[PDB]
Amino acid sequence: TGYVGLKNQGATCYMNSLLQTLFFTNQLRKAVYMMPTEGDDSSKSVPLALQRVFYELQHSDKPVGTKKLTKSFGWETLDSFMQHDVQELCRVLLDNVENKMKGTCVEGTIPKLFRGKMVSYIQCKEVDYRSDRREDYYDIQLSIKGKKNIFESFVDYVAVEQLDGDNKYDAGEHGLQEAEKGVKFLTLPPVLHLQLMRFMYDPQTDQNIKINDRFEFPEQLPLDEFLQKTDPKDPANYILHAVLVHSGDNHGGHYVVYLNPKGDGKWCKFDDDVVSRCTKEEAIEHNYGGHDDDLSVRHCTNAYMLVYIRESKLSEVLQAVTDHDIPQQLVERLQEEKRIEAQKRKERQEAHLYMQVQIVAEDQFCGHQGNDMYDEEKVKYTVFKVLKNSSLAEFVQSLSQTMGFPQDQIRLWPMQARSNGTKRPAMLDNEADGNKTMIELSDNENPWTIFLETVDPELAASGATLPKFDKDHDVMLFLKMYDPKTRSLNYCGHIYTPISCKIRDLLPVMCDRAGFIQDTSLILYEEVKPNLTERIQDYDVSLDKALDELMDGDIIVFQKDDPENDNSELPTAKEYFRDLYHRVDVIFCDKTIPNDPGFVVTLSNRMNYFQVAKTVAQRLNTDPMLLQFFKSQGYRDGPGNPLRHNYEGTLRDLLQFFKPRQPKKLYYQQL
Numbered sequence: 062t063g064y065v066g067l068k069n070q071g072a073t074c075y076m077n078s079l080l081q082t083l084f085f086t087n088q089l090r091k092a093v094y095m096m097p098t099e100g101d102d103s104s105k106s107v108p109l110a111l112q113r114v115f116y117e118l119q120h121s122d123k124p125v126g127t128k129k130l131t132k133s134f135g136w137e138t139l140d141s142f143m144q145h146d147v148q149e150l151c152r153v154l155l156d157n158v159e160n161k162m163k164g165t166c167v168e169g170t171i172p173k174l175f176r177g178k179m180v181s182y183i184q185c186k187e188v189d190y191r192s193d194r195r196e197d198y199y200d201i202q203l204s205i206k207g208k209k210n211i212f213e214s215f216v217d218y219v220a221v222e223q224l225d226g227d228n229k230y231d232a233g234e235h236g237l238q239e240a241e242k243g244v245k246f247l248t249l250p251p252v253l254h255l256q257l258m259r260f261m262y263d264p265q266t267d268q269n270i271k272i273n274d275r276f277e278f279p280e281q282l283p284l285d286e287f288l289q290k291t292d293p294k295d296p297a298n299y300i301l302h303a304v305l306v307h308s309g310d311n312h313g314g315h316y317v318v319y320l321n322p323k324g325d326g327k328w329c330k331f332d333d334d335v336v337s338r339c340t341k342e343e344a345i346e347h348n349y350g351g352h353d354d355d356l357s358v359r360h361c362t363n364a365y366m367l368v369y370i371r372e373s374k375l376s377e378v379l380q381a382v383t384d385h386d387i388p389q390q391l392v393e394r395l396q397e398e399k400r401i402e403a404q405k406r407k408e409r410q411e412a413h414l415y416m417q418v419q420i421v422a423e424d425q426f427c428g429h430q431g432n433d434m435y436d437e438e439k440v441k442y443t444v445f446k447v448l449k450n451s452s453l454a455e456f457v458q459s460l461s462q463t464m465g466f467p468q469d470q471i472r473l474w475p476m477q478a479r480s481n482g483t484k485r486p487a488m489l490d491n492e493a494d495g496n497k498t499m500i501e502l503s504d505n506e507n508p509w510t511i512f513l514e515t516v517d518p519e520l521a522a523s524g525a526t527l528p529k530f531d532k533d534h535d536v537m538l539f540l541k542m543y544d545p546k547t548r549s550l551n552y553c554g555h556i557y558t559p560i561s562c563k564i565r566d567l568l569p570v571m572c573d574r575a576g577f578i579q580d581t582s583l584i585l586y587e588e589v590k591p592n593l594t595e596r597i598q599d600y601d602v603s604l605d606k607a608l609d610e611l612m613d614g615d616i617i618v619f620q621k622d623d624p625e626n627d628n629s630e631l632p633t634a635k636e637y638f639r640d641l642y643h644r645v646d647v648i649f650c651d652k653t654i655p656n657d658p659g660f661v662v663t664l665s666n667r668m669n670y671f672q673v674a675k676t677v678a679q680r681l682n683t684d685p686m687l688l689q690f691f692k693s694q695g696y697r698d699g700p701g702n703p704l705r706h707n708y709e710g711t712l713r714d715l716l717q718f719f720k721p722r723q724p725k726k727l728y729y730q731q732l
Contacts, residue, residue: 065117066334068124070316074142075305076127078318079150081331082303082368084118085322086252088378092170094387096161099394107133108161111154116387116395124334147305147366148200148256155199174378175199175254178247180289183230185240190232200254206261210277215287219244246288249297251374255367260311269311273361275351280341282369295373300324303368306348308360315359319344324370324379414449416500416507418456420464421476423514426539427552431641432591433483433616434512434539438722442510450498457491466515470527474512474537474614475503481590485614486512486539490532514555528557536560536604537613541588542575543620543634550618550637551575564600564607571619582622586634587615592642594618594635643667645712648726649677652691652700659726666713670704673712677729687732695719700728 067077084090094116098109110130117125131137134153159171176197183192201218208214221243224230229237263270278301285297304319317332319339328344330337350363370378419442426434445463447456461468477487494502503509516527530537540553553574558567564585572581585597587608597607597617605611618634626632631640643665650659662680664673670690678685691700695718704715716725 062329062336062338064322064329064331064336065121066124066331066336067114067118068126069333072139072142073127073131075147075316076130076142076150077333078305078316078331079147080114080127081118081318081320082305083151083154084115085303085320086174086378087380087382089170089174090115090119090382091380091386092162092167093158094391095165095167096158097165098161099390103398104129104132107154107157109133111158112391113395113398116391119382119387120384143311146256146260148202148254151200151254171199172197174252175250177250180245180247181242182245183240183242185230185232185235185238188232188235188238190235190238200256202256202258205258205272205274205276208274208276211255211279211282214276215284219246219287249284249288249299249371251371251378252302253299253367253369255369257365257367259307259363259365271307271311273350273353273363275349276363277349278345278364278367280345298372299369300372300375301345301367302370303366304344304348304364305366306362306364308362309358310355310361319348322379324375416447416449416503416509418445418447418499418503419443419508419510420445420460420513421510423512423554429552430550432588432638433485437484443513444508447499449500452496453491453499453502454495456499460513464513464515470516470521472514472527472530474514476510476512483590484510485612485616486537488532488537488613530557534560536611536615538604539614539616540571540574541616541618541634542571543618543637545620545626545629545632548629548631548637550634558604560605560611561603563603564597568600571617575619577621583619584622584633586618586620588618588638592638594638596635645716645725647712647716648724649680650726650728652728652730664712666711666716668712669710670706670708674706683731689730689732691728691730693718693727695723695726 067080070077093108093111096108096112098106098112101109103109107130110133113129114125114127134157136142136150155171155175159169162168162170176199179196179198181192181194181196183194185191203211203214204217205214208217221241223241224239230240230242232238232240257276259272260269261272262268280301282299282301283297284299285291288297300321302321302324306317306319308315308317317330319328319330321328321344326341328339328341330339330344348362348364350361352361354361421435421440421442425440429435443464445456445460447459457468457471457473460471464471473489473491474486475489476484478484489502499509500507514527516525535557536559537555537557539555542551542553543549544551553571556567556570568583569579571577571583571585572579577583585600586594587597588594589609595609599607608615608617620626620634631637645664645666646661647664648659648661650657660680662677664676668676674685674688674690678688681688686706690704692702692704692715694701715727719725
């Protein structure tokens with residue numbers, strides 16, 4: 062189209078429609094370029110922000126962005142726009158530029174184009190005391206309700222008011238005299254910003270409604286019959302320039318603008334990033350209004366602001382803007398702003414197409430007391446920066462030197478989370494998926510966690526190569542030894558074993574692992590998932606029969622079969638996993654106390670309101686009845702509605718809002 066558009070409106074609203082209107086106000090644009098803002102802030106200067114947008118709108122072929130602009134004047138809030146409107150934003154920018162041009166060569170450019178002279182008068186009936194109050198104006202507000210065209214609404218604006226019915230002019234010494242209060246014009250500015258009162262408020266309630274009445278406006282607007290005195294050789298004939306339009310309603314809509322940029326009759330629809338040619342009827346007669354289907358919504362389209370230019374001052378306002386009209390100080394600065402921005406994006410494109418893989422060693426598995434191999438928050442990984450679509454062989458090659466281990470004495474066991482929420486080491490061969498990308502091997506997982514099996518250096522130096530693993534008939538299992546006396550879990554490494562191998566044949570290995578005698582009576586459990594720890598019934602059966610759904614990364618927890626186990630808190634390993642599942646440290650902070658540190662209490666997830674309150678009251682040396690707990694929401698972090706004392710559910714239900722990653726915390730208060 063030649064003219065470039067502005068990037069998509071994101072509750073920007075009318076700002077774009079207004080920017081284009083000001084941008085194609087050529088005489089204004091030239092003054093914008095001639096502003097000393099080479100020493101201002103790069104992200105807090107409104108005039109430079111405009112100079113950026115105007116420059117891009119003139120040279121760029123890509124949809125011009127307005128990020129920088131919204132940050133410069135605190136309207137970056139996603140709702141702080143309908144609080145104001147076009148006439149206000151236009152006053153914000155222009156009075157910010159006018160303020161920033163006082164002293165420059167283009168001093169007072171804004172009043173020359175937009176400012177006109179207006180006189181409000183008050184003439185008494187009996188006495189002859191007038192009130193010639195003279196004011197300037199940049200924007201003219203017009204009435205819509207009951208109006209058919211501009212010619213009517215303009216008369217309504219200059220209509221003579223009467224003051225009767227207990228409403229009388231406070232003359233002072235003459236008391237309350239009945240007078241008039243109409244408005245008259247002295248001069249009409251070259252550029253007329255006429256906002257239309259279509260968003261009148263609705264009392265009551267609430268609070269603003271849009272008037273879709275059919276209001277007309279001409280392409281040629283003679284206004285020489287509205288001044289105090291006519292002016293020959295300079296009639297007030299105005300030509301339509303900009304038509305700002307809205308589709309929808311007050312509480313939600315879409316903004317576009319029909320512009321006549323060189324004022325030649327060639328109109329263009331500036332719908333955001335899509336600039337297109339359009340007819341004159343499509344820009345004028347189609348924007349009068351009339352349709353009022355609340356159901357239909359978009360589209361019920363009509364204009365809310367118009368811009369006219371004086372026919373005599375038409376050639377000067379829409380003056381040709383050459384590229385030489387922009388100071389090199391301004392140019393070179395914006396060029397470097399983008400050179401830094403373009404370089405940054407290149408880095409961010411490299412922030413993409415990259416995945417980091419976390420390597421965990423088996424030394425982390427040692428000493429773990431929770432479920433599974435390791436505690437997610439306590440584990441220390443070895444992170445690597447990997448190409449997203451790098452081959453599997455390239456990763457292994459890079460891992461060999463960075464770890465100081467041979468490329469043959471290591472095996473990579475990927476960590477895949479199972480269906481029942483247990484992240485266990487999966488299997489993946491080196492030569493099988495060698496020519497495959499990492500992002501498809503991880504299956505769109507980033508970051509990716511992989512367990513690294515390394516040969517024990519105590520044997521490697523002596524001479525020991527890492528054994529071969531047959532994916533078809535071999536399975537890798539992990540072992541854990543439980544000591545009831547200490548009530549703790551002791552890690553016993555892992556072992557490769559045939560699938561057809563009986564549990565019985567694996568028993569001498571377990572005894573030697575934990576430092577026991579051969580033919581020692583043991584009790585074996587399978588750690589399936591937390592709080593589930595099924596016991597192996599028969600020992601003289603294969604691995605495929607004993608463990609349900611036999612896979613690589615399965616855990617077998619064993620313990621010494623001894624009558625002394627009964628003489629302890631946690632006899633079996635199954636009971637141990639029940640505590641770890643039921644026990645939970647709850648933080649109880651007082652509601653009335655600001656920033657209360659609180660106190661932790663060890664409870665069970667199967668405690669009802671009674672058992673919970675009884676324990677907390679015991680912790681606080683008081684009667685439970687004097688405690689009022691509150692239903693919580695972790696994310697909102699604020700105590701919701703108070704908790705009744707006849708609550709049937711348990712503590713588990715009250716903590717469903719809290720992720721396991723977060724410390725549980727309930728709120729209370731004293732009665």
